[model samples]
Target: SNITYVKGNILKPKSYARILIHSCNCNGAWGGGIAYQLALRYPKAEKDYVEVCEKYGSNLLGKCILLPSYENSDLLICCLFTSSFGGSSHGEKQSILNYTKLALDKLKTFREAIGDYLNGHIKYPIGEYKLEMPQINSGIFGVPWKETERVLEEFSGDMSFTVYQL
Candidate 1:
């Protein structure tokens, strides 16, 4: 398919909405950029995030957190990176990749939550998509844009979807 592109910030808004996911392997600390953003908006989400860290520890690297945006009602789904928020350069490290797989594994888990907000939600069949390279790699966790795209693609029609590269 020929993916259409918007020339400018056509999709941009004054106060945009999004579903934010992150690699929880960072021990519930909002070290990364997006993590800090999410922490600002949903304090409770941050609390749960911290709790998730305390409960799961850095090993919760492969799990995901579904945060609903009460402001825009946009479902923010974060995939926790099991290692450092910055991944390895060689891509030899599998911590972020591992959690991405887990995130993909649980894509359907958020459908109900999305459905409640969106009346007409549709799910898509699986496929392969590439991810953008990491901001910094240290054999830990990094944002997986490819998997994030897959999640947005699978659930875009169900609800509003947007990604922030921090």
Candidate 2:
């Protein structure tokens, strides 16, 4: 598990099969921050994400939703639901922390599933999937970066992430 931090834009593609993650509110609005950027770049994926939230409500938090970008099939948008409606303005710090942990755990499961497919146990088509993210929670979510970094570091043994710094 390796974690690499770099200064750049997370929306730009650096790899063919990549997982670009960002936090989303359970309210299903892709109206601000990275979520807005993603919605503008990938409308189809935004629709799918919004649908998921519409179906799940706050239950969507602590879960990972992987959506294929309609504009670029090689790119995947990972929505890590960690807040309730209205984002941090309507969420608690402890609740955000708990939801973040749950979301990351779900990501680990995805990594393992991709690994299994790569090893020939499954026939799933996963190109070279690499995980990437922005400074999540620090933007509109209002959580401190170090707090999120600590949670990310806790998964260092099971996962590697490439974090983008703006």
Candidate 3:
């Protein structure tokens, strides 16, 4: 279920941007639902996705990524994962543990770079932040959802995934 009330503004996007972090068992092709939709719109983004897959190997395929929608730019920056958590594929218990650490680090790096690219300095500093995942049994996203939540809570964030239903 979508949360009606939230602090951040759900601005009507003049354009669409999405970063799909997937498990590589499906190959670099965007066959899954949300991912497929994204691919249909942005073939360039799909190309970048393929590049990431080639370099990182399939193990890190389920990593958290942020693919931005550039208003007008020559180059695109797609988030790369040194590691990954649970996604639409099978993964080990410690996968998320490793991926969370990598994700936070990447977030910091990206925000800094983005700030520099646009404003020539870091402006919107992330004062406090949290990352969240859903609670599930097994399959696709992986096992022990509670543990994943706990780890993310402890080492990652307090921010919940806003688009989920019980």
Top candidate, metric lDDT? 2
> Considering TM-score, where higher is better, how would the candidates rank from best to worst?
2, 1, 3
The lDDT values for all models are 0.43, 0.77, 0.39
The pairs that clash in candidate 2 are none
Instruction: Please give the distance, in angstroms, between residue 136's alpha carbon in candidate 2 and its true position after superposition.
Output: 0.4
lDDT of 2 by residue, 1-166 (tens): 3669999888766645787888889888998888888888888788888878788898787988777776775677778888887554758777887788899898788767612112322222543577889998887778898898888888877888999998
Q: Which stretches of candidate 2 lie over 4 Å from their true place?
A: 114-127
| Model 3 CA lDDT for position 92 | 58
Q: Residue 45 of model 1: what lDDT?
A: 60
Per-prediction TM-score? 0.51, 0.88, 0.48
| Candidate 1, 62-138: lDDT as tens digits | 55555443444433334444453332332234555555555534544554331222233212211111111122232
lDDT of 1 at 132: 18
Query: After TM-score superposition, what is the CA distance of residue 150 in candidate 1 from its true location, in Å?
Result: 9.6
- Prediction RMSDs, each to the true structure: 8.0, 4.1, 7.2
lDDT of 3 by residue, 1-166 (tens): 2212234322223132222222233246555444454566656656656665666555554354444324323222233342332244444557644554455455555544412232322122332222222232233445455554443354223232322223
Q: Which stretches of candidate 3 lie over 4 Å from their true place?
A: 1-27, 58-65, 70-89, 112-139, 155-163
